[PDB]
Every structure is written in structure tokens, then in C-alpha cells.
Design a protein around this nucleic acid. Structure first.
Ligand SMILES: [K+]
Ligand SMILES: [Mg+2]
Ligand SMILES: [Mg+2]
Ligand SMILES: [Mg+2]
Ligand SMILES: [Mg+2]
Ligand SMILES: [Mg+2]
Ligand SMILES: [Mg+2]
Ligand SMILES: [Mg+2]
Ligand SMILES: [Mg+2]
Ligand SMILES: [Mg+2]
Ligand SMILES: [Mg+2]
Ligand SMILES: [Mg+2]
Ligand SMILES: [Mg+2]
Ligand SMILES: [Mg+2]
Ligand SMILES: [Mg+2]
Ligand SMILES: [Mg+2]
Ligand SMILES: [Mg+2]
Ligand SMILES: [Mg+2]
Ligand SMILES: [Mg+2]
Ligand SMILES: [Mg+2]
Ligand SMILES: [Mg+2]
Ligand SMILES: [Mg+2]
Ligand SMILES: [Mg+2]
Ligand SMILES: [Mg+2]
Ligand SMILES: [Mg+2]
Ligand SMILES: [Mg+2]
Ligand SMILES: [Mg+2]
Ligand SMILES: [Mg+2]
Ligand SMILES: [Mg+2]
Ligand SMILES: [Mg+2]
Ligand SMILES: [Mg+2]
Ligand SMILES: [Mg+2]
Ligand SMILES: [Mg+2]
Ligand SMILES: [Mg+2]
Ligand SMILES: [Mg+2]
Ligand SMILES: [Mg+2]
Length: 72
RNA sequence: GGUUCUCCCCGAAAGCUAUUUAGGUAGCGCCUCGUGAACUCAUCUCCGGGGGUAGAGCACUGUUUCGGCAAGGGGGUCA
């Protein structure tokens, strides 16, 4: 084996999605994120457990129990 | 507002629900890729079903025009 002749296993490497590089790329102009809206914007997207202003599942359900000191 | 090379396969939605929500967002529904599974699924034929729509009708709910039957009544007449 030479330093050139080495090569990786097939399927190991996968290039990567490069957004905004023409029509032919596929993704390109709106880099796979649609037209307008909060999610299209830079630094967009809502925080975790946010259901559009509806009271979230992790708040409409009651909280229960106590963490045991002895179990630790 | 703009988001820069190329070819191959599949290919939506503009609905429901909720929202200080309504040009935003979230779960489901529809798109995709992956992994599993039964004759699963569609079509047609023949069965077993529940409708109470279209249409129709007037016993009931109401409405409606005649004719008949008139209880009930409106005007008159007395000592
Ligand atoms: K509908
Ligand atoms: Mg390779
Ligand atoms: Mg490649
Ligand atoms: Mg490289
Ligand atoms: Mg990288
Ligand atoms: Mg890039
Ligand atoms: Mg692509
Ligand atoms: Mg595209
Ligand atoms: Mg995307
Ligand atoms: Mg745009
Ligand atoms: Mg829009
Ligand atoms: Mg969007
Ligand atoms: Mg920014
Ligand atoms: Mg931000
Ligand atoms: Mg407590
Ligand atoms: Mg096609
Ligand atoms: Mg509800
Ligand atoms: Mg509603
Ligand atoms: Mg909306
Ligand atoms: Mg808005
Ligand atoms: Mg599939
Ligand atoms: Mg796996
Ligand atoms: Mg069968
Ligand atoms: Mg089944
Ligand atoms: Mg069948
Ligand atoms: Mg039959
Ligand atoms: Mg039958
Ligand atoms: Mg029947
Ligand atoms: Mg009818
Ligand atoms: Mg009718
Ligand atoms: Mg009859
Ligand atoms: Mg009759
Ligand atoms: Mg009735
Ligand atoms: Mg009545
Ligand atoms: Mg009548
Ligand atoms: Mg009459």
C-alpha cells in the first residue's frame, strides 16, 4: 500500500448538503426551508415544547412524585 | 429582499384541531427515505346491513282554496 492507494469503505463518507448552489443542486434558493414564515428566517424556529401558544403538554399535565435520596 | 455547479428516482399542501390566533406556530391528515410485516389494499361480481336524502304524500306539526254540515255568534222584534 502507498499513501495514495488507500481509500475509505463505500458508504462511509457522504459529501454533505450544500445549500444555495443553483437549481441543479436540488436544494438551492430557499435552502430546503420553503417560502417565508418564522422557520425560513435566520435564527428562526420556535423553542422546545412550544405548540403555537396553546398550553404545552409539559404544562397541561400535572407534576408528580419526589426524587428519593436513598435511591441515588 | 436575496441565497452561487450538474445529472437520476419519488413527489405534496393551501385541510382538521388549538393558539393575545388569523399573512406565525404546533399535533394529526397529505410528500419523502429506511426497516418490518398478513392476502393487507384498490377495482368488479354476488351476499349481510343501517338509513329517511331525491322524489312523493297529507293520519300527525303547521299552512292553504273551494263545496257541504253547522254547533258558536252579528244585526233585528216584542209585552
Ligand atoms: K373537509
Ligand atoms: Mg463513495
Ligand atoms: Mg456524492
Ligand atoms: Mg471531501
Ligand atoms: Mg461539514
Ligand atoms: Mg454551504
Ligand atoms: Mg435533493
Ligand atoms: Mg426541489
Ligand atoms: Mg426541509
Ligand atoms: Mg423568498
Ligand atoms: Mg405564505
Ligand atoms: Mg414555512
Ligand atoms: Mg439574524
Ligand atoms: Mg432567534
Ligand atoms: Mg408539589
Ligand atoms: Mg411521476
Ligand atoms: Mg376541541
Ligand atoms: Mg373550532
Ligand atoms: Mg393560518
Ligand atoms: Mg403574523
Ligand atoms: Mg415507504
Ligand atoms: Mg437501522
Ligand atoms: Mg380478503
Ligand atoms: Mg387491515
Ligand atoms: Mg375488495
Ligand atoms: Mg342484494
Ligand atoms: Mg340485501
Ligand atoms: Mg332500507
Ligand atoms: Mg324529504
Ligand atoms: Mg322535496
Ligand atoms: Mg289519504
Ligand atoms: Mg285524501
Ligand atoms: Mg315536529
Ligand atoms: Mg305546534
Ligand atoms: Mg283553511
Ligand atoms: Mg269555505
Amino acid at each position: 500500500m502507498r499513501l495514495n492507494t488507500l481509500s475509505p469503505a463505500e458508504g462511509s463518507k457522504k459529501a454533505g448538503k450544500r445549500l444555495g448552489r443553483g437549481i441543479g443542486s436540488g436544494l438551492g434558493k430557499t435552502g430546503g426551508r420553503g417560502h417565508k414564515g418564522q422557520k425560513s428566517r435566520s435564527g428562526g424556529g420556535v423553542r422546545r415544547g412550544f405548540e403555537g401558544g396553546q398550553m404545552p403538554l409539559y404544562r397541561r399535565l400535572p407534576k408528580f412524585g419526589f426524587t428519593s435520596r436513598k435511591a441515588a
